[PDB]
Write a protein that binds this ligand. Structure first.
Ligand SMILES: [Zn+2]
Ligand SMILES: [Zn+2]
Ligand SMILES: [Zn+2]
Ligand SMILES: [Zn+2]
Lengths: 374, 378
């Protein structure tokens, strides 16, 4: 099998790429192309040829149950041999990853960007028909929730045609023609959703902060946890218009709520929601995680105020490893040599001011250290 | 106790800062200032006041054995109370850290920069007397090996006066006057050491790569491991003048050397028997961020286009379960789980049951991150 690479685009999704390779190389559809691709992987003795799908929907490596390592070996084999000039196909796929969010949400990764798993669309993929007839392909941003408007046309996305039928471009091509009525779909204008769509796309959108793309999706997942509901585009832009003193206003109202509802107060009894729900979003890089960077800025100037209220909050050995980013073996070693001053791992024997100053002594890094929020 | 902050400088060392606070606040030396500082920490009921040293040599928190957590609480207490305007003193100290280098070298951290532990000077600290009489303080770069010339005066550092006596600024002040002869020290000019000194200082030095300061010291420790000797300033700049095709020339010569001298059947070849030196000596320098670790980023670039060439020579290299966790950055509990559900295809942990091409593609499937992923060396 010998193929031709189409016009490359670094924002094209993986399912939109196989349609354009099949249409350029004269195949009938993408079902035929993947079935002929599985035939080629059999002929050169690939170990997981039989797990290569003929369905466009399950092509991505998060779809594969145990073929995840054989799927990316299959994707790396095709880009090196079957093309006149080697394409980029691993950079368009959505891989699983071991990275977790706060508190326990898993994640997926696409090239140089990490997405939340819960914000991945799985029922029906919306689309913009203006991009389908100008760019000629589909973007990866249509697979994730929150991205509701087009960042370059300011038009809302479509999930249903005028005849009640849905339109999925993976099964109905890239042209924009419906299946039942075989007609182009008629379109269905705000500003707050347009700003977030231009912000999630990777461009500078004010007043939203200039963050890497892995961190911009972490704030959207974090904002859905604060309101404890779905994502609101209006209150999200307004919250960062008063940055950082709007985020300071919440933490004051949370500690006034939990004090009224004192030497026995724990860290999970006063700051159990804000602190543990902001550690890994996606990681502890305080240069880019502005939520954990500002929360540690607020708790630094309040350690020994109010007779040491914050610095005397009790902690376990489990939740000490979450803050210090270490293991229970190093915690049990630091009670042997007693760098950390007092074993039951679920026992409250440590104070927050001692854990905060142990981090400034033995557990800083080049990314998780205090020198960014100064 | 009420003190005055001197002129602040973000490159001043910690031992040079306490001398300038004591000289501004009218103390006699730094020995009577730290001893008066220990007296203040006793008066406000600090838990580790009795471990606060009166020696300026052991003022850094890596010198404290068990009281390293009490030392940084002592440093955080002084900056908040005893000054008219709060200084920055935790940012000048040299803390220990849990970060290891390759293969097993420990590390220290100073603010936003991680240093190798073995490159930390412990016998005698050299100095530049021109910076002592112009800037008025000392820099932290004088505490680390490799930094041999001044990056702004291009003069070699001094460890010995003209009368045979050493000059340590921690015990002899910041002026530049010797102890025996009480005279200023007479100085003792290349280019290759001047480039590395301007590169380790944090400025752009060509042809050396634009890296963060935590990674620039990692290359110097790595270059001492390749030659298996001390650091050479001439061959270091020349090696990055032919980047990356000079580093490609070594890996070709290593796999040709190892294959010819292999003691086992070409199919029984292991990853430690062919690439045991280059791969395991480049994982954590300091970490796996392939955006800035250009050694591991280029070694995985070279081994990607050679997996199934030569009848799958690289992709059939045997690995253990121990050295699978080093590459995947995981634990032995997740490895034992992936032999239960069999995402990874075959328990004795020191047994060679896995191939390198399967571990490399399992990483592209289940173990990428925002920093350790393939999308940087494309
Ligand atoms: Zn659009
Ligand atoms: Zn229709
Ligand atoms: Zn200079
Ligand atoms: Zn002299």
């Amino acid at each position: 099998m010998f193929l031709q690479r189409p016009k490359p685009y670094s924002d094209e999704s993986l399912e939109s790429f196989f349609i354009r390779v099949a249409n350029k190389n004269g195949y009938g559809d993408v079902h035929r192309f993947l079935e002929a691709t599985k035939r080629f992987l059999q002929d050169i003795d690939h170990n997981g040829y039989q797990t290569f799908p003929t369905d466009i929907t399950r092509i991505n490596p998060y779809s594969a149950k145990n073929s995840s390592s054989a799927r990316t070996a299959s994707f790396l084999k095709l880009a090196q041999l079957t093309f006149n000039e080697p394409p980029e196909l691993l950079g368009l796929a959505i891989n699983r990853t071991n990275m977790k969010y706060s508190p326990s949400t898993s994640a997926v990764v696409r090239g140089a960007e990490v997405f939340p798993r819960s914000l991945l669309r799985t029922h029906s993929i919306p689309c913009c028909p203006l991009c389908l007839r100008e760019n000629g392909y589909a973007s990866y941003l249509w697979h994730f929730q929150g991205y509701e408007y087009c960042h370059s046309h300011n038009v809302p996305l479509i999930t249903t045609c005028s005849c009640g039928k849905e339109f999925d471009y993976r099964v109905s091509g890239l042209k924009g023609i419906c299946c039942k009525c075989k007609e182009p779909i008629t379109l269905t204008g705000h500003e707050a959703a347009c700003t977030v769509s231009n912000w999630l796309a990777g461009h500078e959108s004010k007043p939203l902060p200039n963050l890497p793309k892995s961190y911009r999706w972490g704030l959207v997942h974090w904002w859905m946890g604060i309101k404890d509901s779905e994502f609101d585009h209006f209150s999200f832009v307004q919250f960062f218009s008063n940055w950082p003193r709007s985020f300071h206003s919440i933490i004051e109202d949370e500690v006034e709520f939990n004090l009224e509802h004192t030497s026995e107060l724990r860290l999970k009894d006063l700051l159990g929601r804000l602190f543990f729900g902001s550690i890994r979003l996606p990681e502890r890089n305080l240069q880019h995680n502005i939520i954990l960077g500002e929360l540690l800025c607020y708790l630094e100037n309040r350690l020994w105020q109010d007779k040491g209220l914050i610095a005397n909050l009790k902690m376990n050995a489990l939740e000490a490893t979450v803050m210090l980013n270490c293991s229970l073996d190093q915690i049990a070693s630091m009670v042997e040599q007693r760098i950390l001053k007092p074993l039951d791992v679920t026992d409250y024997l440590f104070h927050f001011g001692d854990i905060f100053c142990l981090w400034l002594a033995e557990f800083q890094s080049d990314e998780f250290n205090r020198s960014f929020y100064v």
